[PDB]
Amino acid sequence: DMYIERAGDITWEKDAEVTGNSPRLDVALDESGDFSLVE
Amino acid sequence: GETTDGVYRVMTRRLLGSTQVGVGVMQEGVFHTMWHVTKGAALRSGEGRLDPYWGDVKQDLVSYCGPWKLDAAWDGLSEVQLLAVPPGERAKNIQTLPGIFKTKDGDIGAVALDYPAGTSGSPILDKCGRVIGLYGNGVVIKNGSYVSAITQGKRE
């Protein structure tokens, strides 16, 4: 049995850690809601 | 129970100790999370109970207490913030420029940040603090890393 606990406010924070790249990927979405790589 | 707006952890005591299986957004009295986090099961909020209202396995989304309320969209140009809520760790904002998932039915924004599976449901925000989608449904690239879509529901 599942339960919820508050973790914080939803706010934009100035000067946050800027990381991660921006890749363009060819994907397919199936009926089970799972993505896969199309190549 | 607690229905204040904000980000929340989704916990379970069924396994060893207390385990974080996901995260969610409380907005306008509705709890929003990813389908694979809860499988549509009822949730507990203190003494209160949250019952599922809408859900879809293909979109991988589910809402509790009412219809899906989140309807902001990524503008296709600006940086966003993943408000990551990792298991056992403090909520933390991570700024990134999203990539693109190209599909046969159009393009979707995608954030390339690798977090544990228990981080699923963590909101992705625009500069106004509005939730433009949830993190936790994507793909595993050649590197072994995870790249999640910016998954957004429909506000009826």
Ligand SMILES: O=C(Nc1ccc2c(c1)CNC2)c1cccc2[nH]cnc12
């Ligand atoms: O596996 C993940 N997500 C997921 C699981 C089950 C299902 C779906 C998505 C959609 N259909 C059912 C995941 C989420 C977040 C970070 C991750 N790192 C490695 N895998 C993940």
